[PDB]
Design a protein around this ligand. Sequence first.
Ligand SMILES: Nc1ncnc2c1ncn2[C@@H]1O[C@H](COP(=O)(O)OP(=O)(O)OP(=O)(O)O)[C@@H](O)[C@H]1O
Ligand SMILES: Nc1ncnc2c1ncn2[C@@H]1O[C@H](COP(=O)(O)OP(=O)(O)O)[C@@H](O)[C@H]1O
Lengths: 72, 72, 500, 179, 12, 481, 480
Amino acid sequence: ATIRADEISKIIRERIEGYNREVKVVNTGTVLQVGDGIARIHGLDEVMAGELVEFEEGTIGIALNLESNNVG
Amino acid sequence: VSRVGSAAQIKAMKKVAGKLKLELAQFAELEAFAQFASDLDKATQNQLARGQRLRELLKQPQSAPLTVEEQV
Amino acid sequence: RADEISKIIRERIEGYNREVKVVNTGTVLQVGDGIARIHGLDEVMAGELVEFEEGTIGIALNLESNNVGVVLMGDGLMIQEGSSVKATGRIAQIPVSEAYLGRVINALAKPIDGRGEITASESRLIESPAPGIMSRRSVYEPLQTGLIAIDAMIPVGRGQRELIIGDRQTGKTAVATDTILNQQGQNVICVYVAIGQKASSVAQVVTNFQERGAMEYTIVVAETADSPATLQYLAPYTGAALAEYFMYRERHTLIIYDDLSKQAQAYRQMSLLLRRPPGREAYPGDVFYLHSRLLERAAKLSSLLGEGSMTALPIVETQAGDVSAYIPTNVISITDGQIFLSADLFNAGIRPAINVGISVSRVGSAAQIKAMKKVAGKLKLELAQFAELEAFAQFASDLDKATQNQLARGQRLRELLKQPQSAPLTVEEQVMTIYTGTNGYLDSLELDQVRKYLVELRTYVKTNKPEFQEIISSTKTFTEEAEALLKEAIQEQMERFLLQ
Amino acid sequence: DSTASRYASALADVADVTGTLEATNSDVEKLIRIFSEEPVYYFFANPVISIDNKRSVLDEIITTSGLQPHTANFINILIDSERINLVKEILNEFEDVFNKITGTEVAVVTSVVKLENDHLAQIAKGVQKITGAKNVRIKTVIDPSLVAGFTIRYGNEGSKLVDMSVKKQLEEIAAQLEM
Amino acid sequence: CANLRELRDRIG
Amino acid sequence: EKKNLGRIAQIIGPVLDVAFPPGKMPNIYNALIVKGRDTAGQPMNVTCEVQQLLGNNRVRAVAMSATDGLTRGMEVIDTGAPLSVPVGGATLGRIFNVLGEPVDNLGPVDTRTTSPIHRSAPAFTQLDTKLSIFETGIKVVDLLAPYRRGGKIGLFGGAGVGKTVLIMELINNIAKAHGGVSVFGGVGERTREGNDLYMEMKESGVINEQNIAESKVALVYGQMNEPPGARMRVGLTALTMAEYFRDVNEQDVLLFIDNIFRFVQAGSEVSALLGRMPSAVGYQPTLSTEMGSLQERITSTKEGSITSIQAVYVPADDLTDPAPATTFAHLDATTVLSRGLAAKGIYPAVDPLDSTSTMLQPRIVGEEHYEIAQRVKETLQRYKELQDIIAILGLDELSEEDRLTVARARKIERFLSQPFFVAEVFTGSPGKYVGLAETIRGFQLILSGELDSLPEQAFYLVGNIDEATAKAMNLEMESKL
Amino acid sequence: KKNLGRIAQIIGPVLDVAFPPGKMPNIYNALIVKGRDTAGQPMNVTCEVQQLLGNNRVRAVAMSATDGLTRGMEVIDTGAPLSVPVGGATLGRIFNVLGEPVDNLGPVDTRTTSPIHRSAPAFTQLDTKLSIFETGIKVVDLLAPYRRGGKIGLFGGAGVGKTVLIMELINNIAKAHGGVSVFGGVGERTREGNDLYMEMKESGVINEQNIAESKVALVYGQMNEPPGARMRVGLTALTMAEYFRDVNEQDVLLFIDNIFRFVQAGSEVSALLGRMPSAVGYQPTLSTEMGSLQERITSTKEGSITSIQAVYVPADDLTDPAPATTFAHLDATTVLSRGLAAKGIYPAVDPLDSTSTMLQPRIVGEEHYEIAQRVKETLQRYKELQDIIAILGLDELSEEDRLTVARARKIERFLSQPFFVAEVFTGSPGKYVGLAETIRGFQLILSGELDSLPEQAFYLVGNIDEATAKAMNLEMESKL
Ligand SMILES: Nc1ncnc2c1ncn2[C@@H]1O[C@H](COP(=O)(O)OP(=O)(O)OP(=O)(O)O)[C@@H](O)[C@H]1O
Ligand SMILES: Nc1ncnc2c1ncn2[C@@H]1O[C@H](COP(=O)(O)OP(=O)(O)O)[C@@H](O)[C@H]1O
């Protein structure tokens, strides 16, 4: 995708502070593009396909389709 | 339909039955229109008979070769 | 004068002195066969028509982030993909004046007849907010459409946007022209915009107007086929901006569009080129918004605004005679009623082919004058009863005399309805016609001779009883003297018609 | 925005949060001068070339020109993801984003002849006053199109344009037609 | 429409 | 809320994609006004709401007014909350557009109290149990096809059939008999018909031009001029303006949402504009969800009922396609206004036979009401059948066990016609409100067999059945002369 | 010119070429590609620029086959919008869309070449003289008269007519018209193009002995050409006709066959071009392209381009966009129906649907107008009684309406015609019958004076006198 969901300026700042540096984010992710009931979360590499991810307000989400960077 | 017409038939075929396509496609209308009938004259009572005997003779059992005279 | 002509040039040469303004100027990324996805125009309002280095003016609709996607109002062959295109502070306006009366124009409001160049200092913006509900009023006065079918059973009052919708080739253009040709004694400035119609048909219509003499007051905004997509899109709005001026200056008007299906087709063109997501039938997102924006600016203004009235009368060409398609159902939801010109009733000899049934009018009898309010009531009732008894049309075999008389009178009433081509029936004649038909006074004649009898009766009346003219034109109520005069005239004409 | 503008804004935010801004801009100029000259651009594109070889030659071309460390990580991430084929456009829009963040705005003055530095600084005063930028940068281009004076192409990207030039006689003859 | 128009004709 | 200045990055037609600083972002449906500049030289501000988020701080927002003249980079200001609608006793009489500014030019409305448009649903504990009949005051509706208070109601009949006098009667009878007020919620209302309705109101005493805040209607007119985001949200604007009435005065409210198919049409328009891939026949994918969000806040909360009356216009006349399907999945009483009956003059033109309601069942209405309603529907079925044959045989030739049926059928068909508190401006009849008990006993007396001697035109345009006997006794007095 | 191109991508027939930045061709600018052939080095395939993509590359549709083109092949822009050779030299030769001779005779001269995609004629100069036309066909001279110097449309299903009718119409008129005819095989099948070329050269129209004399000038962009070619062979025919109407001052008669190909090829290229799909599958700019063809056909005070486009209705979808946009442009439309062909009534012209704006009475003659109205009304009554007849039996209707049914049968069979070019399909010789003769026939048919003849006596008959003779023939054959 030319406009990938993992292309927010703040998000790529997080990756550009360290290229091949200190161990990645384990379980903390900033939600982005929370639109049609489908929030694309950056990070969360420990998420099992089908996880029960919680949000800030307290709205539960199933992590069905999780791509290379965004765990949608 | 045939877009080449009877120009792609033998002279015998065009002589014996070249008007056969239109005559028969016309008989189809007179058949579908005189299925329901009242006070049919002799013109219709004999024209439908001719058209019936003109439809009934195309019943080729497959894989049986008919030489050109056997159609003429 | 051989050098005085060049001396005239010195006036403007010394006049224009060119203060330093800001022109929003960006480069052209992409010319897309009608669209020019120019880049860099930041402070350009959505709708400012831009002008290129080659004078190919075009409107800027699709303002994406990194490329303002403009559409070209001309044949854009000369754009060079790098020619710096400048913006203009214009918001797609057109000049408007009284002197447009009679000269056919394009969407640029530039005269295409060529027999002059109209001057104008007043300019009405082509898109504009429609009359608000504080200013709009209810429909009082009727617009005589010249047809008995669309002025007795289904009226069209001034300010009501009826809909001439029907099958392909049924008489929509001919009925709209019959209305514009009748609208001669009255003061309505009838603007007839033609979208996508061929050049030859627009020539035939303008020469018909000039032959009938009704071209004194008719701006035929003409959009030929090879005219680009933007002009076939903009033409209804151009005619609307002319008629809105003529309405806001107290003059009742009548704007008759042509092929709103073709207008929406041109919008489909320019949007799908501009890459806007398509809805049903591939028509773009805002079709309904579009048709409303040019079609809901047509109504009667109030007393404090000037009493004027823009009475739209669109023509929506629907194929296979249906209303299920996107454009006909949208414009039917927008328009106060509709008339259905059916090709079956057209080929069956009923000209105009106005469907007497489903073709409802939302205003109802509030638009008709008192004479019509009295007579067309019985006409509508008897046509309803005849349409109910249309199944017994041939099978009425010596049946009850109520049935037989009612069916015969209905059969005669539909030949009252049908009327010749471009024949305008001034109300003073059509009231007497509908009366003569609905009160059995022509039950004696067969189905064939009703037309000849009625033409001869109308001639004899309008030549030998001119008090009926005073009554119907001035008093506008079918009172006792007019009724008795009409009865006596019918009797005398029936006698001399029997004498043949 | 565009993807290139997003990457440029990332690099500009880094040049902000780390005190290496002007060095970052000079390094980006060096880097776009590098990623011109089609052979090297085609080398960093054309994904058949192994990623290890690509990043190794990247390390070498960093340690040759001596770029800032963070912009080296930036181009390395560009190679890591499959969006390296945009690198020229990214480095191109970096001038836009860097200037917008730093507060400098570019004004392109096009004159028939070379414009003197004092009057160029006066034009800088004017553009600075009308726009509201700190250190307005005037990159002049000698053009034979005009006749007498200058055009100012200040703004976001070309958008605003003021000029005393051949546009004068152009408007004169065009509104002289008046038809 | 050769599918819808035929059914409109049949319903008529 | 905050000076959340962003730039209006992309403006495609009506949809205007605005960007925002990375700190603060307006969430979905959070209205935002842009500090726009018109071509004329006045700073008119066209309001918008965030229909969709697109991730890179750019919230795709649809406009409540024309976008002709919005430069990119214009200051867009967040409100922090959905579109504030000026609810209250103040908004009782004036006309409103979607953003909540009176367009009837009378004056400003007290914005001291305002509720957001997109307040969520009521709760399971807050919903009411008893399926309570809603006494309208029309004999036809109250007998044959009752309306559910807190439910939904469909007026299938078009305009020209008498829909405007019917809704005016319903509003005036709500203000007279019940304690509540109504809210006409015209969604995509053709402006000519809008001014028609407004003048009919002002001349029918429904709203007083001399006395506002004493009137009985909260007009919300979303004209079809306005962009698709506007006439879509006009339904929800009327809904919250009526929900304030419900949950603040505990009174029965009526929503006369104009034909729902325009609301679903506007939803399709705005979704095709947002580019979200279209669903079946062409309405939005979130058709069920959106129309349910419009018609689920129509519920009789413990505070008070908010029963609505929603015209429905089937396209191409099918119950099959999704928009009428998803609407009729919600309606609780469907009453069609019949054009032929209107032309006859049996006002109100509501068709007694084809109209139906889910409330009609005996456990809901009453066993005697269900019995008399089913018997009246069977009698009118018998008359619709024998209308064929009374032309051929005559009223005398056919059997005199069903000549009684035809006679009582004429009596019922006339007795269903009721003079209205609104028709006084046209004809001069005073107007009678008929309770449910009164029309029940009247129809029981008509159909049981007592009043087989009263003339047929004594039941026409009369209220209670004793008033019909009074009409017949007056005709008997005048029979000698 | 000299601006080398270096073609970047070749996605099917649409190839986009990355020009240098300063030197970029305009839209609709011919691009001869100096490319290799399958065998051998030299080959010139032509392309016209359709849009400028803005990455220094422009999208161009291919006029020749797209096979054999290399990514990186040199290509120059001509700077001239695909000029086509016209004049006295174009008479007699079959022309490609490129503007070349296809008949392997001596090549044409380039003395009077003309651009192919030019602006429309302005409305200020439009000759509108309404004059009826006598083609020769009974029905479409009576039921739907044609406008001389005006567009005419032979709509129809796939194979109902519209090419045998075009052949008979050219066989009739192309001799009579002093001005030449410019037949355009826009996406027509090649074998019918062969038949038309042979029929022209045998009918003295081509005059193979003196090729420079012919009253016809063909262009073939026939069915087997790349979608670029069918997109513009209509414009080639239009350019030849527009030259013969702008300069030679003679009224010309262009026959375009299957104008629907001019829209379908536009569809196949617009799909690849990047333009979004419209309704049922055609291009977005269907209407503007169709108008760009149809508007250039107008009588313009220097002559009169009468034209008969054999529009193809896609599977008789008479509501489809491709005929729905052409109905607006076509004056004397003529909808041919498969329904009235399946029963053998040829030509398959519908009596009802085929309508013309030359059936106004003051234009066509009062008695002719009245006969046309009565024929159309009788056929409409028959089409309305088709439901009662088919279900409830022929007898269950009235005995005056039965006379109207038999009269409608007589009429709809009498408006059959033996064409001269359709003798190979009929087997019977052709009879050319004038206008006044068919009026005099219909008067006696629907006046009830001769309702005794058998229905087959009115089938495939030239004139009413030949119908009377066939009645005698049939009554003798009945007993014999
Ligand atoms: N009263 C009438 N008498 C005779 N002919 C009529 C009458 N009304 C309409 N017509 C016929 O209608 C035809 C023209 O109608 P019209 O131009 O509306 O068809 P159309 O093709 O649908 O219009 P458009 O080109 O705008 O779509 C003429 O051929 C004319 O014969
Ligand atoms: N007058 C006629 N007599 C007999 N057959 C005909 C006649 N007219 C048309 N046909 C048949 O119908 C077909 C229609 O012509 P055709 O060339 O198929 O049209 P298209 O070019 O649209 O396919 C012809 O091929 C022919 O076989």
